[PDB]
Design a binder for these strands. Structure first.
Ligand SMILES: [Mg+2]
Ligand SMILES: [Mg+2]
Lengths: 178, 178, 178, 178
DNA sequence: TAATAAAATAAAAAAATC
DNA sequence: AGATTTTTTTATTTTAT
DNA sequence: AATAAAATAAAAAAATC
DNA sequence: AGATTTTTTTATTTTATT
DNA sequence: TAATAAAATAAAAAAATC
DNA sequence: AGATTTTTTTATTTTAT
DNA sequence: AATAAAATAAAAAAATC
DNA sequence: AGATTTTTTTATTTTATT
């Protein structure tokens, strides 16, 4: 059992913090992918499909943090730009599934190449901690909180992106490459 | 140095973790302020003027993570709803200072009465951690990152809210009241 | 559940750490008190009495992490040196109580004067962390572990020492004094 | 910078934690090894020499947090009990290098099979934390502090012990075996 | 709709001019 | 750029004999 | 039992704002 | 330099969209 | 005891010496 | 410098009519 | 049950390694 | 400078104490 004050204190503090973060993250994310004329959720969708091939609209709307409507509309615009593949399987024909086309994987890799960590603000904001820790910050308390909110299945996005990028990419001339 | 691989690993973990965390906080925040016909940034501006009286447009755009222009446009709607008061100053009339009207302060205080932490998802997410530790999670690594991004003066908002809630408010019948 | 390998991995990591930590704290503690011809458990006994006046030999042994016989022998050795006043009282007389004499209080505070944090190596080892955090490390994970082993009653010594030192003392010429 | 009050608020908190933690580790470690009539520092020496074959007396004293006189005398007693081999090198003859004999390896790995986590207090104190996290506590803050006090070369023992337990041992019938 | 760049604008400060 | 509603569609599911 | 009819509920998909 | 003029800088303020 | 001061002692390197 | 053992000592608990 | 006992337990107080 | 001698430095190695 808890004081109401002590809740307001915790609720307001993590509000400000999570808004400060993500806005900083959103800015650096949209700056990096505007050259390729992708918006944030769009790019997130393509990454959802690369790690989770064949996902359903509601499934990608799960792993990217977006409404089901946003996923359908932004994923069909990725279809017309030729970056996404829609599909249906008629055991249950209410369900529309998406796959990444070759063009889309390509722009993912090219965006991966244009990545410059130094122009990302939380990267630079986290480097102090890394220096004395020996590793980048884990932010485990946040991962615990997120898990209890979204469920362990959601958290599959993390380790699918961890293992895949550790094995599906390498560094040559200071850029990430396949 | 660091690997550009090791960098991406950290950047995708924090990116998704914070989009998760903000969106969760976003919807719970929208839900409690719609009864009084506010949006997040409007409510955010009102709390900033409560804690930082007579602050510049650019200042409340600093403390609330918003653009100067969104600060000025939502700050004017708040005075057309009567909740804010605009002033200018002797030394430099380019600045425009903002104060809370007592209609504005009232709706803040009434919303504080409606606050049910049980309906906030991040709060329920942090309860298991609160039990083990005995106090709420501090997410200290994130406070450090945000600080090295926004700088020490942005971080006065956390301290001013902490002190003000603690010394301006008090519990009665499970609600926070003056 | 846990694998035996995973558990051994944790049990050696903390055994080596707690040994390392305790031994450096042991040396600096001895340096500090050898001038006054005290030993660790004697100095801890006197500090237990200062925070917990009228405490039993068994009770002193709880907070001082020492065997009850160890407390007994070292405690009456302190009475010969005239810093401790034994008592026996009221209903039950198998219990032997302790309080701190005038001579004992002064040697505490005088040792508190000779305190130089820079000669203590664990202080120095935490200074890099304190810069980045703002405050000293909270070492919460071992605080949780130490509680689960010893119980919430035991952890009252932390809480009693925190409050007493905070306002039974003040700083003068780089010295703690009453 | 820091206060002298703030400095000793930290010094006492880690003194008391360190002592509490080392003494529940002390007595759990003793109980485990008395069956094979070893003491803690003798058992440490056997694990130092297993992980670091050919270690010097001084080096053994580094990794096992003990005086060079104790590591010598307890290394001797291990030679008289037939578990450690004493060597010299003709290039520099003031050095004296230690190496486990096969009788020495066998007693270590029978004790490895004797290991029951559930009799260890610190393990059980840590199980609630492993529940929330998914992994055991890392107490990074204590690793940071200990690395600054002892230096990065000492800290090699954690990394070698980690990887050696990982690869040299396997789980058969709920016990760690080679 | 809740935000936001990209202009636009007015005022203060800073820099040029002699 | 990214929501909320509402529609509209399919398939389970639940009834009703 | 079987069915067949009738809500109820999954999953999109299509206008708002 | 001291009195003026010019350019830049700062802070909005409004406008064009997502 | 399970430890560790404190000398004590052999070697080796380092400084000195001319 | 610290314990693990012994002992010893009250008070409490349990067992007996 | 009311007592008195045998037994148990608590808390020191000793002697070892 | 090169060969020598002499000091310090290092690593045990043995003592005695809480
Ligand atoms: Mg933590
Ligand atoms: Mg605690």
């Amino acid at each position: 059992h808890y004081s109401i004050k002590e809740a307001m204190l915790f609720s307001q503090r993590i509000a400000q913090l999570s808004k400060a973060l993500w806005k900083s993250i959103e800015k650096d994310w949209q700056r990096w992918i505007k050259p390729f004329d992708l918006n944030i959720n769009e790019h997130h969708i393509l990454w959802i499909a690369y790690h989770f091939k064949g996902a359903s609209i509601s499934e990608i709307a799960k792993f990217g943090v977006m409404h089901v409507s946003t996923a359908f509309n932004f994923s069909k615009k990725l279809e017309e730009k030729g970056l996404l593949s829609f599909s249906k399987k008629q055991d249950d024909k209410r369900n529309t599934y998406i796959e990444l086309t070759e063009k889309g994987e390509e722009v993912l890799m090219k965006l991966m190449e244009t990545y410059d960590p130094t122009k990302n603000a939380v990267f630079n904001g986290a480097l102090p901690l890394r220096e004395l820790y020996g590793k980048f910050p884990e932010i485990l308390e946040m991962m615990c909180i997120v898990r209890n909110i979204y469920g362990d299945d959601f958290m599959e996005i993390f380790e699918r992106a961890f293992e895949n990028i550790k094995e599906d990419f390498i560094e040559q001339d200071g850029k990430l490459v396949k």
